[PDB]
Each structure stands twice: as structure tokens, then as C-alpha cells.
Symmetry: C4
């Protein structure tokens, strides 16, 4: 009932524990479950919820054929109860569009959807279930945003937007919103060459986003935002542990202010928790495809260009598919510190499972533990052959 | 918790932005979605909802065969959450009948359903979920009303009703209700010849309805109601930009107090926002059928008989079906002014898609923007061939 | 938040208007709708709801075969939102059993289910969602109760129970409950010979029940209960307009304290509103079967043995099936007087539609109007042939 | 809004009455009902709910094939409304795992799920919908817990956990939690040799659990916990009325501090209400398999090794399947004393109904009565042959 403020630091992450899992495509083989992709999680002061971009069809209905394509007029941002499947009967529609981000400021929720032709898109900013501000395309080539939650501090919620090429220079701007109104916006600054799909968190009055360079880095770019002064900077994560996909093998030394060369023009959304010695990175196991997922503790990843792993935990084995991953935390949980959390999208269907005509996914999510806990793997679990 | 009062004027409409879309018949190909028609939207102080007249069947159930017919004992007014499909499991029934209107007065909701044989129908007025007043047929030939929301000011909610022929003179009365009780009623006055299906809004303590002359105008009639003094007047929109369907081509000069001749005995429900220089009109693109939809800014449409378009925005392309359209606004949104909004029904099935035995529809809805935003088209999106 | 008291008299009933209709078996041809029978309606201070005894199956599931039988361990009292179908996903279970009654006292709800073998049944009295009192069989042959709502006055809610033969003398007791505890009980008194299935209402601190004599009256028995003094009396409705089914034709003179002879050992549950000149009776049109339904104004029916109809209204035409009917009113509606209401069960399936293996029903319900409104007929509306 | 305290003693149990029944597999033959096992019931201050471990599939979906296996990554603790089926659309997920226990302390709910490989499992303790404490495996062979509700007194909720062999000595610890944090833990003490699956209740500031010795007793072990002093003791129920399954026939004398020999290495979860002369025991009728269920009053069962039955009540007949059974009570019900209650799992599918490829169950539950009520039997009621 007053605005949240990032007062705490992160707890120490000694391992990760299961937080949510919806088993969507299993249950979707015989229930009215919606086809989705681009998932995230976001909390409110009294409940956390699962989020995604619908495709306007059930998995087993005939309009599922073709849902590999990303933008169209039938997609919408939807949220459902934690660890339930996105079902026709139990989902809330937030706004209409094919790209999105959402966060609670402590009083109410802000949600952003973007819709349009490639060359004439727009974003409209919803605050307390109502349309309030609208922005139109500035560079005229797919105005897109985070695909996971934003973070607010005392009313200001910064969002990163990118408009222009995915294959060369683009135009990225950080917008600072308070109650749906634009307070100010800046263009991208610092040394990062290209920004797409930022995964963000906040602690001790500072916001950290780990993003996706699609043009040329296999190492990830980092934007650090100050919500009071409303300024930002960018860098790349120095560590030679590379974390985009596809990517070349890991080198011995890495790069702090330049992209690491090797693959060009493709990527995946990812995250990291950058906190000195208490720094963990997530990545696909495969260097060629989005398959397998693992967490690795690389002390001082951001600042040391020779930093190797000290500890790890496998989340999805290499034989199963992963997809986008992103950060969230529950800033309304009781405690001295913020507990870190993430999610991994588990895509099933096309492109890799060519025997079906659709593309959908489930979620698995995880939070930290100060305890050193044993691990298990968390695969989607459907058998594609039942859908034939 | 006290009655709403129309205190504000309209914002300036420089373009329109997507507000809601339910993709009902797509999802209805494999979910328990109800067959409907005659949709509208209506807000409460804390949520806006989608509304329609059910047919008492799912799209894919066998009693869908025959739902082209308009009146029967299995239809009911239902409402569901914004941008969800009218599903068996998620709909609230408001009252039983085949014609309806509904509005919130700031304390609670008033809903009107009408049921009967053609020659012996009645309306019962529900207020705060209970039956309170009942009116019986006066001219004995299909007592019908708005098919979209009414508007209240300090407790008085005027509704327009028509009883009698659709093909010659009829008997139309404006009723003023306060808390479900009739304060007064008048017969239609001014110069409009025939009234059917009024789409209404209010601003600065005045209510404007744009209606449908079914007997002989291709230009639309306008009733202006004063909720304090409880009086009204009618006219036609002077502009030569004609907006009923079917209609002849646009002339050079139009008609303020007479119907424009050309087509006879048929029409569609429509709306306009009549606000001096800030006047927008909606219409089908086809002059022969309900296909395509577009918004056009015609400054001073109501009062100037030579007024041509200054700006426009295509909402549905000509190759896709449209249907009824109607006004709504959210009089409980924060702001200095009322933001204008509308919806378009997108009918699928019979008469035009003769290969199926049913008739159902989806909704797309839109609100204003002071920004000049790019456009996209918003078609239903189902493929009829999947239902064969 | 304090106990309701029957302060008002009835309004004048000049005609009846549609109140609720769920179209259950139509929508049940392709939705997860439960098989039911024995329906009623009952209001709470803030919403009215539909009630019935489930059979533990959907209409289209295979355990529907056999649901003609009345008692078994898979039946339960369930309630759902007004004018919705009894669906798997939207129903609340109240208590487990094959006979039931329920009423709100103004603070919370009392519900009674009965379960057992024929010779060893029991009733348990639920108050504010919890078990509180239990009664066991006294005459050891199907302990049964109202199958529609009870009525409370200042905390006392009388219920009529019958244990013993349906084909000769039985043992009927009126129990007076306050907050789930038994204050007192009496055996049946006055002149009525046999009591089954009472339909009750209250006005001006008195409760009236019209019941079913199954042994030998084609005229109905009436119990009048005083909730303060906790006493009762019985009589039969004097009028020669006979209202049980099956029944012989109407005579010229009727019987006040004896059953009218003609048919023996069978009946249907029914009701009447007995209020001097403002007295209305409901009945099947067919004298042989539960088909058609109509309301008839017979002034002074209770007390005059030569009273003929003055006005009427057809509710269901003779060509369609009806079933049980029962009274309810909304004692929390605003007004100077209690508005009368009823429901009719519309049974479909066996015995009469022998081509299917199941038995289920829908509801239509109606309330009074001081206006003289036109009528329509309200049939179930499913086509049995779609279920083959 | 303050912590519950066990202030009352038990009421006298003179018979048992139906409390809840969900008929899940009947309705599951044609609805989206989840496959489950290991059920229980647990109350909150304002509603009681049904609980179970999901398998991540509907009964009629193809991933039902194989659900006989107990642990996997697709299981979760779920709760639904009392006497409804575990449906996709109406279930709340509590935490992810294949073993669980849950209880309300009067302020909010505590829930524990366990997940892992056999040799590397962990438990995470949820309090007020959030992760708070995590424990890791101590003996490295299936860390498991109660499979029914825990009981709190003034904030302390003791839970029994077992880690190690089911076929020899294991390592069992009683943990005392207050608001999700561990106050203290002890290892098992007293004379019981092996503990698995405790069914617990509390009265007059003491908690009683009746558990399962899997290694070698056909008589059940009892742990008595003091929540203030945080200590416990164990014994076996002296009575010669044996209550595990499988078991040898009943002897003439039984054993208070040693297991009764006869069967080795297998069992079922069960309960008892141990209250001097007012002591009731539940058991399967079959000595070879989980089929039939009955309640028997054996005065002083715990303390007398020659105690025979005085009264009984059959709950499920021998020809039908039963499964796990467990205690619950509603410590927020109005009254002078705690009313005792239990549930029985009714397993259908494999191992015994080998003609289907799945394993699922329904619930029947019961509470006490001071009245001597007649009995009925409460079987699952599905016909397996409809699933072929
Ligand atoms: C019970 O549960 C517990 C708790 O989970 C289990 O204990 C955990 O076990 C894990 C598996 O052993 C272990 O995870 C590994 O940790 C290593 C860290 O240990 C090192 O440092 C510590 C401290 O100094 C020492 O104790 C230890 O000896 C080691 O020195 C990581 O090194 C591991 O990650 C690497 O291996 C995996 C595959 O095994 C790779 O997928 C991963 O990417 C890492 O390896 C690649 O990357 C590094 C860094 O660049 C390269 O140098 C290396 O060559 C690899 O490079 C190739 O591969 C990548 C991807 O394929 C590619 O991109 C690149 O180009 C190359 O091709 C791993 O994280 C946990 O730390 C441990 N936890 C605890 C608390 O102990 C226990 O086993 C369970 N079971 C039982 C029975 O108890
Ligand atoms: C990115 O997004 C932006 C934002 O949406 C896009 O920009 C918009 O582009 C629209 C399409 O060009 C444009 O809409 C048109 O606007 C015209 C208004 O412009 C005129 O006035 C302004 C100011 O003076 C001038 O700048 C301009 O030069 C023009 O003079 C309207 O005239 C257009 O409507 C008419 O055309 C459409 C078909 O194109 C018809 O369907 C419509 O009914 C109108 O035409 C009929 O009616 C008129 C009036 O009677 C007749 O005179 C005419 O002959 C037509 O009559 C026949 O047709 C009707 C129906 O079929 C029939 O009933 C009748 O009998 C006849 O048969 C149209 O509204 C937007 O204004 C513009 N917005 C902005 C902010 O700039 C941009 O393109 C996007 N794309 C890219 C790559 O950026
Ligand atoms: C528009 O809507 C309006 C509003 O609804 C419509 O107006 C209504 O029209 C109804 C149909 O005409 C009418 O209902 C009838 O009312 C009669 C009452 O009228 C009499 O009294 C008044 C006042 O004195 C006079 O004005 C009038 O002239 C009459 O004298 C009832 O008599 C009618 O009920 C009887 O007929 C129906 C069949 O038509 C039977 O089913 C019913 O059971 C009644 O008849 C049986 O029972 C009586 C009494 O015992 C017997 O005497 C008789 O012989 C019948 O007995 C056989 O049948 C029963 C059952 O089958 C069986 O058990 C028995 O043994 C025998 O076999 C009927 O109720 C409304 O009153 C009228 N309302 C108003 C406000 O005016 C209007 O039509 C609509 N349409 C249009 C175009 O406007
Ligand atoms: C209407 O409803 C009412 C209310 O429910 C019905 O009344 C109830 O009727 C029940 C059935 O008769 C009755 O239940 C039985 O109660 C016996 C207690 O009675 C004895 O003591 C009282 C007081 O002294 C006396 O009045 C009476 O004469 C008796 O002496 C129990 O003994 C019964 O349980 C035993 O029988 C059943 C089968 O019938 C077994 O399944 C059960 O396990 C018990 O028997 C086994 O165990 C005992 C103890 O070890 C052995 O000694 C015995 O040999 C059996 O052992 C074999 O079987 C077990 C399991 O198969 C196996 O493990 C073992 O190794 C051996 O193989 C039973 O509980 C209720 O008490 C009575 N209630 C009331 C209030 O009166 C009424 O009938 C209904 N119907 C009508 C028409 O009214
Ligand atoms: C956040 O900080 C502002 C002042 O900077 C203060 O008013 C507000 O109460 C703080 N937030 C909360 C949740 O206390
Ligand atoms: C999917 O669509 C393509 C054309 O877009 C068609 O060839 C294909 O057969 C469809 N798949 C199925 C299962 O119908
Ligand atoms: C509407 O006007 C009346 C007096 O005309 C006033 O009492 C009421 O409070 C006004 N409405 C609101 C929402 O303030
Ligand atoms: C629809 O109904 C007509 C008769 O009303 C029948 O001829 C037609 O075949 C039906 N359509 C279907 C698909 O059964
Ligand atoms: C009913 O009557 C009692 C006294 O007889 C009174 O306390 C109570 O308030 C009355 N009911 C209501 C709703 O006022
Ligand atoms: C219903 O059950 C009977 C036996 O009880 C059986 O003969 C009949 O064929 C069943 N009906 C259907 C449709 O299976
Ligand atoms: C439980 O006992 C504590 C003190 O031991 C007391 O504060 C608390 O209020 C008691 N519980 C309730 C529900 O009163
Ligand atoms: C279940 O799975 C087994 C192999 O795990 C397979 O042989 C069997 O046929 C399956 N059952 C069904 C009905 O498909
Ligand atoms: Ca890249
Ligand atoms: Ca016209
Ligand atoms: Ca009779
Ligand atoms: Ca054992």
C-alpha cells in the first residue's frame, strides 16, 4: 500500500531447490491447455504467478498447426496460478501483443504489450488494469522488450526496449516509468554492442540486467541501472565461461568490453546473479542447441577475465530441451535478504520435434538455498508420440 | 459508493490502440465455448467485462445447428472476464432473454432482458442482481432495446426501446430509470424517422446515442439526452460520409433532418463520437455487406452537410467479416478526460459461410490515443474448414 | 448478521415473469455437466443459487446408464450459480446423501442430507459448513425429507420428515432447529392422512407448506407452522381444482379434511401460494403424466370447496415434460412485500424417453409481477436424438 | 489470527457418519480429473479441503500409463474443495514432490514436499505460501514423511521423518517447527523398531501418532509427542486385534513393546483413536490385501494385551478395495470437544486391476457421532470395464 524499496542484499546461494513446475504439455495432451512460449514468473505482495504469450489455441486443437511463427494478431500476455497449466478456463489476460514485460510496484501492477506489423508497431502501458501510455515505433523494425519482469524502486520501474536490426546496430532506450507515465528515457550507453531480451533483478537500490547480444557476443552484456538518479551503464561479463547459445567452446581468457567472437546473428535469452564471490551463471549444456541447462558458481564473473567454475548444479540434462531462462525474486517475502530465483522454458514441438505441427513449452523454476542440497533433473516429461 | 456523474469531456482522439480481443471461435474449435451474437463491453468501478446473448450451446455441440435464428427460449445475457472466450465454466448469467442493455450507476448494475413471443413480450429490469420492474409490450411486435450499454448520470439511466415495425413507422420511447424504478418515459421526438439499436456515451452531463434507422436512412439518426431535465431531441448526422450497411456510395452533400434514400429495410448497429473537430465515425468498408471496418475523422459530421474525411484507421480488412459495433467508455479510469472506446462483432458461420450449420462471433475492442500510432488489422482468425 | 424475521406479507400476483433457466441437458450434450434430479432454488442474503442431488456422473459419461434409480452411495447435494448448468468444475458439495433440504437463517446456512440402506438411514444437520446434529431412522423405511428449502424465523427453522410407508400410514414429525441443534419435535397432527415432500414459504410470522399425500389424495395437504410457539396443523386444500398427478378430472365440489379419491399410491411434488383472494396453484396439464405445467388463480382455494379458476398462465406446454415444482422467495430483497417464486424440474431420459439409458433434468424458475405480463412457454429444449 | 491450542478432549465415539466423498474415478471416466494417490484431508480455520499427490496427468490421457510407480519429477501436492474431484481446473498446487504433510497453525499453513533421487533427496518447508527452510537427506535412502496432516500447538508443529531402509533399521527424527523454522529435532526413542507414515491427532495438549512398522510388526507403533516440552516416546498398541496388512490372524494375547511376528517387509498406512474406554481402531478386513475396511471399538487397546472388540462398523465391504487411511480433526469447529475423523483411500487400477495401465483412487471420509447411527458401505463405485 506504499511503494517497495530495494533495501536488502542477496542471500548466499549455496545450491538451488524446486520452486514451481507446471507439467503443461503432459496434462495438455488431454486438457484445454493453451499453446505458449516466452514464459516468466512475477510476484505480487500476496501471490507469485506464471506468465506467458498465448497463441490463441489449445495444443490439441487444429489451429495449433503453425504456432512456430512469433507474431500475429492472436497472441496475448496471460497469467495463471503458480504451478498450474495455462488452461482456457483459468488464465487472466493482461494485454494483447506479441512481446511483453510486467512488474508490481507495491501499490499495483504495470504491464506492457506490443502489437503491430514489423514496420508499424506500438507499446501500450497498462497500470492497475487500465491503458495509460502508448509509445510508437522509433526505428521501424520490430519494437520489442524484455520477455520477463521489470523491477521497481520507490515508484520508478525502468524497462529496456530495442527497436531496429537484430543483425547489426539497433536503437535501444531505457524508459523510467512511474505509475504508467514516462518520467524520462535515455538511449543505451557504455560499451555493449547490441541488446535484446533483458533478464533483470534489484538489491540495495540498484538494478542489474543480463541481456542478449544477438549480432556478435557469445559472452552476455550487462546493463546496471540506478532507479533514483535514473542513469545506467553497460559492459560485458568478463568471464571466459561463455553463456549464450550457440557459442564456441570456452577460452582461457574472456572479454570485458568487447563481444567474444565465434558465432554471429542468433542467441537465447538468459540471466546471471552477479554478486562478487556469490555469483552464479546459468547456460545451455549444448554449445549448438538449446538442450540441457546448468547453473555454475564463477566467483567475480563480471570483473575477472580468467574466472573458472568453483561449484555447479545440473538443472536439465543434455538429452532434453531447454529454451529461454530469466530472473525473478519475491521482494515481499519475510527475511533479512532477497532469495534469488529463475525459470527455464522447455520447448517441445518445432523446430527440433518436426513430427508435430505445433510449438509449445512448460516451465520449471527454482530458488536459492544456503544449504548444500542434492540435485535432480527436471525435464518437460511429455512423449511427443502420444500426439500423433 | 455514491452515484457517478459525467464531469469530463472526451480526450482528443488522434488514433486507436488494441484494448481487448477474445479469439473465441479459434479457441472454440476445441474448448467449451458458447455460441453468441450481439456483443458489447461495459465497465464497473473496478473491472470492465465482455457481454453477449448466449444461444444455450457450445460451437461444437450439435444444438449449434440452427443458431442463425434470433429469438428463442434458450438465449440469455451473459458476461465474462475481459479478453477471455465465453466459456461454459467462466460466464455469469445476468437475466434470461433475446434483447438486452446494461450499465453500472456507480453504486450497482442495472440489467434489462426481454423475452416473449413476438406479439406478447416483456422486459424485466434487474438492479443489484434482483428483479425490480417489468414492462410489457405496447405495440405488440417485437419489443426490443439497445444491444449495448446504457449511461447513467447521478442515478438516472435513460434507455431507448422500440416496439413495432422495422419496415415502416414504429413506437419508440425513452425511459429514465433510477435504481430500477421508472421515473418518467417520453415518446421519440425531433426529426428522426425510425430508431433501432442505439449505441450511446456521455460527457459533460449530456448523453449522445447514434442509432439505426432501418426503414430508410443510410445516414444515422442521433438522439441527444439530458439526464437532469430528462428530455431528448433527434436529428440525422449531416455528413455525406454514409455509415449504415448496405448503403449507396457517398454523395457530395448529405442530410441533416431527413434520411438519405438509397437502400430500404435493412441495416447494422453502429456508433460515432460526435465532438466538433474531434469527431470520428466507424463503418463497414463494403457498401453491400458487413465486411471490413474502418474509423474516419470527419470534423463536424453532425452539423456540416458537406464534411469529408481528414484522417482514418483500418480496423478490419475488407476480406474479413465484421457485424455490430457500439460505444463504451470507462468512466472510473483516472485522468482529466474520458477516453473513447468501441467494439466490432466479427460474425462467422451463416449466412455467408454456408458450409457450417451455426452462427457465432468474436470481439475485438479499441480505445483512443492522443499519440498518432501505427495500425494493424484485427480479423477473427478461425479457419471454417477445421469445423468440417 | 442477525436472524431474519418474516415481517412482510406477499405482493399481489397478477402474472409471473422468467427468473432463472439453466438449459442444462442442451449444453450437457457437449460439456461436463452432472446428471441430477430433485432440484430447488434457495437464497442467501447476497445471492440466490440453484440446488440438486447429483448422481456422481456426467450426462455423456458411461456411468450415466442406470441413473433412473433414486438412492445409492454416489449422490450428493450440490449448489451452483444462478442460471448456469451443474458442471463438474463449478459446483459446491453441501453434504452426501439421497434426500435433502436447506435454508439460510440470516447468519449462516443449514443443510440436511440423508444416506443409508432403506432400513437403516440417518440424517446429519450441517450448520455453517460443519456437521453438528445427527438423527437416525425411527420407523425403518426410507427416512426422507422435503427436497426443497426450509424457512426460518428468528433462528427457528422447522423441517418436516417422513419415515415409513408410502402406501399406507407413515410416521411424520416436524423438527424445529436453531443453529443446527433440535429445540423440540412433534408428530404430525390435524386431518392430513399422509405427507411426503413439502414445498414451504413464510410471510407475517407464519410458515405454510403444501405437501404430497402419496397414499390417497388427489387434492394436496397443507401444514401451517407457527415458528414462535412451535406448533402446527394440517388440512387439505378444499378447492375442486385438483393438483396432484396422476389425478381424476376436476369435480364440482372438493374436500377440506379428507383426501379426494381417484388414483392411489403415486404422486409428484408441487406447491401453492395460499393468500385469500391472491391464491395461485400450479399443476401438470396432463392428468396421466408429468407433462405440461400451468399456474391458476383460484380465489380462497384452501377454505372454499367449490372454487373455480379466475385467471391462468401456461408455463410449459403439454407436449413437454415437467416433474417436481416447489416454492422459494428472496427474503433479503428490498421492498414492502415478499415477491413469490417457484421452479419446475423438466425431466428428460427414462422412464418416458426410453431410447437413452439415463435420467437428468433442467430448471426453469419464475417470480411474481403486479403487472399483467404476456406469457411464453419454457420447454427443456434438448433433442434426445443427438445423444444416440 | 493467534495460534491454536489443544484445549479439549475427544467427544465419545458411539458410531461414525459420512463426512466427504468425491467419487473421483467415476466422474474421471469423462472429465479432466487428475491421477493421484496418497490422499488426506486437512482443515483451515474457515474450510476443510481434500489433499493428494498428483501424477501430472488425467486418468484418460495417455501419460496415465505407468502411474503405478511412486516417485518421479511430475508429482506435486495439490488441494481442492471438499467432496469435489481433483480436477485440472480446480486444484491448488502447494509444493513439488513425491512425499508430503501439511497443517494449519491458526495463523497460516505449513506444507512440506520432498523431491530427489533416492540417494539425494531434500525437503523444503513452505509457510504462508513461500519457501522458508530446507533439509537434505541424512541417511541417503528415500527421505520420506507422513503422507497426512501434522498437528500444531501454540506455534510448534512436530513432524516425523524417516530416512533409510524399509527392510531393516532406519533413521527417524521428530522435527519441531515454529513458523517454518526448526526449533529442535530429536532421533526416535522408546521401544518401536521401525517407523513409516504416521497418522496423528492432538487433544489436551498432547499429540498421538499411530504409524507403520514396515520391517516386522503386524501390531502398530505409537509415538506420543509433547509439543511444549518437545519430547516423545514410542510403544506398540498392546491389543491382540492386529491392524496392519498383510498380517496373521488375531492371537489371544498381543505385545506392548515388541512387534508381533508373522508377515515381514510390507504394510499400509493406518490410524487409531486411543482414548481409554473410547478407543477405536480401523483396519482392512482381508488379512492378505488392502480390501474392505472396518472400525472396531477395543477398550484400552494401547495398554491391555488381551483386549477384544466391544462394538464395530463396516466402512467398505471386503469385495472392494481400500488403501491408506489417516486421521484428521477440525480444531476450529464450535463445541466442548474435538470430534474425531478419518479418510480411506480406495485404490483402483494396478496392481490388482491389471486390465488398465494406470493407478488412481477416490476418498471417502467420516466423523464421529455420540448417537448410535445405522451403517452403509461406501465403495469407489467405478466400473473398470468402461475404461477399456
Ligand atoms: C548429490 O547432490 C550433490 C549436490 O548437487 C552432488 O554434488 C555436486 O556434483 C556436481 C557434479 O560433480 C558438481 O558439479 C560440477 O562442479 C564442478 C566444480 O568442481 C570443481 O571445483 C571444486 C572446488 O575447487 C572441486 O571440489 C572439484 O574437484 C572441481 O575442481 C564443475 O567443474 C562442473 O562443471 C563442469 O562440468 C560439467 C560436466 O560435468 C559441464 O557441463 C560444465 O559446463 C563444466 O565443464 C565445462 O566448463 C568448464 C569451465 O569452462 C570447462 O573447463 C570444462 O572443460 C567443461 O568445458 C566443456 O563443456 C562446456 C559445456 O559442455 C562447453 O561449453 C565447453 O566449451 C567445453 O566443451 C560441475 O558443475 C557440484 O559442484 C557438486 N556440488 C557439491 C555441493 O559438492 C552429488 O554428486 C550428488 N550425487 C551423489 C551420489 O551424492
Ligand atoms: C503506419 O501507420 C500509420 C497510421 O495508421 C499509417 O498512416 C495512415 O494511413 C492511412 C492509409 O493511407 C490513412 O488513412 C486514410 O486517410 C485518408 C485521410 O487523408 C486525406 O486527408 C489528409 C489531410 O488532408 C491528407 O494528408 C491526405 O493526403 C488525404 O487527403 C482517408 O481519405 C482514407 O479513407 C478513404 O480511403 C479508404 C481506402 O483507402 C476508404 O475505405 C475510405 O472509406 C475513404 O475513402 C472513401 O470515402 C471517401 C469519403 O467519402 C471517398 O471520397 C473516397 O472516394 C472513398 O469512397 C469510396 O469508398 C467507400 C468505402 O469503400 C464507399 O463507401 C464510397 O461510396 C466510395 O465507393 C483513409 O482513412 C491515415 O490517415 C494515415 N494516418 C496518419 C496519422 O497519417 C501508415 O500508412 C502505416 N504504414 C507505414 C508504412 O507507415
Ligand atoms: C398474451 O399474454 C396474455 C397473458 O398471459 C394472454 O392472456 C391469458 O390467456 C390465457 C389463455 O386464454 C388465460 O388463461 C386461461 O384463463 C382462464 C380464466 O378465465 C376465465 O375467467 C375470467 C374471469 O372470469 C374470464 O375473463 C374468462 O372468460 C374465463 O371465464 C382459465 O379458465 C384457463 O384455464 C383452464 O383452461 C386451460 C386450457 O385452456 C386448462 O389447461 C386449465 O386446467 C383450465 O381448464 C381446466 O380446468 C378448469 C377448472 O377445473 C375446468 O373447468 C376446465 O373444464 C378444464 O378442465 C379440464 O382440464 C384440466 C387440465 O387439462 C383437467 O385436469 C380437468 O379434469 C379437465 O379435463 C386458463 O388459465 C389468462 O387468464 C389470460 N390472462 C389475462 C391477464 O388475460 C394472451 O392470450 C396472450 N396472447 C395474445 C395474442 O395476446
Ligand atoms: C443397522 O445399523 C446398525 C449400526 O451399525 C447395525 O448394528 C451393528 O451391527 C454390526 C454387525 O453385527 C456390529 O458389528 C460387529 O460388532 C461386534 C461387537 O459385538 C460383540 O460385543 C457386543 C458387546 O459385548 C455384543 O453385543 C455382541 O453380541 C458381540 O459379542 C464385533 O465382534 C464384529 O466384528 C467382528 O466381526 C467382523 C465380521 O462380522 C470382522 O470382520 C471383525 O474383524 C470382527 O471379527 C474378527 O475379529 C475378532 C476379534 O479378533 C475375532 O474374534 C473374530 O473371530 C474375527 O476374526 C477373524 O476376522 C478378522 C477379519 O476378517 C481377521 O483379521 C482375524 O484373524 C480372524 O480371521 C462387528 O464389528 C455392531 O456392533 C452393531 N452396532 C450396534 C450399535 O449395535 C445393524 O446390524 C444394522 N442392520 C439392521 C437391520 O439393523
Ligand atoms: C520507500 O521509500 C519511500 C521514501 O523514499 C517511503 O515513503 C516508502 O514508505 C518506502 N517503502 C515502503 C514499502 O516503506
Ligand atoms: C499444417 O499446415 C500445412 C500447411 O500450412 C499442411 O500441409 C499440414 O498438413 C497441416 N498439418 C496437419 C496435421 O494438418
Ligand atoms: C454526483 O452528484 C451528486 C449531487 O448532484 C453528489 O452527491 C455525488 O456525490 C456526485 N457523485 C460522486 C461520485 O461524487
Ligand atoms: C441441421 O439441421 C437440418 C434440419 O434442420 C438438417 O438437414 C442438417 O443436416 C443439420 N446439420 C447437421 C450437420 O446435422
Ligand atoms: C429478528 O427479531 C429479533 C427479536 O425477536 C431481533 O433481535 C432481530 O434483530 C430481528 N431480525 C433482524 C434481521 O433485525
Ligand atoms: C446399460 O446397462 C444395461 C445393463 O445394466 C446394458 O444392457 C445396456 O446395454 C447399457 N447401455 C449402454 C448404452 O451400454
Ligand atoms: C494459545 O496460547 C497462547 C499462550 O500460551 C495464547 O497467547 C494464545 O492466544 C492461545 N491461542 C488462542 C487461539 O487463544
Ligand atoms: C503402456 O506402456 C507399455 C510400455 O511401457 C506398453 O507396452 C503398453 O502397450 C502401454 N499401454 C497402452 C494402453 O498403450
Ligand atoms: Ca549471440
Ligand atoms: Ca438503413
Ligand atoms: Ca396422490
Ligand atoms: Ca508391517
Amino acid at each position: 500500500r506504499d511503494f517497495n524499496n530495494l533495501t536488502k542484499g542477496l542471500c548466499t546461494i549455496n545450491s538451488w531447490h524446486i520452486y514451481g513446475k507446471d507439467n503443461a504439455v503432459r496434462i495438455g495432451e488431454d486438457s484445454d491447455v493453451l499453446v505458449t512460449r516466452e514464459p516468466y514468473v512475477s510476484c505480487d505482495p500476496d501471490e507469485c504467478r506464471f506468465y506467458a504469450l498465448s497463441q490463441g489455441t489449445t495444443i490439441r486443437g487444429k489451429h495449433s498447426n503453425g504456432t512456430i511463427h512469433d507474431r500475429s494478431q492472436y497472441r496475448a500476455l496471460i497469467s495463471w496460478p503458480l504451478s498450474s497449466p495455462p488452461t482456457v478456463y483459468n488464465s487472466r489476460v493482461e494485454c494483447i501483443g506479441w512481446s511483453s514485460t510486467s512488474c508490481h510496484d507495491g501499490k499495483t501492477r504495470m504491464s506492457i504489450c506490443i502489437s503491430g506489423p514489423n514496420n508499424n508497431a506500438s507499446a501500450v502501458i497498462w497500470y492497475n488494469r487500465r491503458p495509460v501510455t502508448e509509445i510508437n515505433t522509433w526505428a521501424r523494425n520490430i519494437l520489442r522488450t524484455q520477455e520477463s519482469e521489470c523491477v521497481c524502486h520507490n515508484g520508478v520501474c525502468p524497462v529496456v526496449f530495442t527497436d531496429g536490426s537484430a543483425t547489426g546496430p539497433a536503437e535501444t532506450r531505457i524508459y523510467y516509468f512511474k505509475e504508467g507515465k514516462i518520467l524520462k528515457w535515455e538511449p543505451l550507453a557504455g560499451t555493449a554492442k547490441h541488446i535484446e531480451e533483458c533478464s533483470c533483478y534489484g538489491e540495495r537500490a540498484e538494478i542489474t540486467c543480463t541481456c542478449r547480444d544477438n549480432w556478435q557476443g557469445s559472452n552476455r552484456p550487462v546493463i546496471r541501472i540506478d532507479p533514483v538518479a535514473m542513469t545506467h551503464t553497460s559492459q560485458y561479463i568478463c568471464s571466459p565461461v561463455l553463456t549464450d547459445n550457440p557459442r564456441p567452446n570456452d577460452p582461457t581468457v574472456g572479454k570485458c568490453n568487447d563481444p567474444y567472437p565465434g558465432n554471429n546473428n542468433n542467441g537465447v535469452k538468459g540471466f546471471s546473479y552477479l554478486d562478487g564471490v556469490n555469483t552464479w551463471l546459468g547456460r545451455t549444456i549444448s554449445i549448438d542447441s538449446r538442450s540441457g541447462y546448468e547453473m555454475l558458481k564463477v566467483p567475480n564473473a563480471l570483473t575477472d577475465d580468467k574466472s573458472k567454475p568453483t561449484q555447479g548444479q545440473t538443472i536439465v540434462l543434455n538429452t532434453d530441451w531447454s529454451g529461454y531462462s530469466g530472473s525473478f525474486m519475491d521482494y515481499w517475502a519475510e527475511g533479512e535478504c532477497y532469495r534469488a530465483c529463475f525459470y527455464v522454458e522447455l520447448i517441445r514441438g518445432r523446430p527440433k520435434e518436426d513430427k508435430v505441427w505445433w510449438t509449445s513449452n512448460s516451465i520449471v523454476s527454482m530458488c536459492s538455498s544456503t544449504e548444500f542440497l542434492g540435485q535432480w533433473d527436471w525435464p518437460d516429461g511429455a512423449k511427443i508420440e502420444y500426439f500423433l
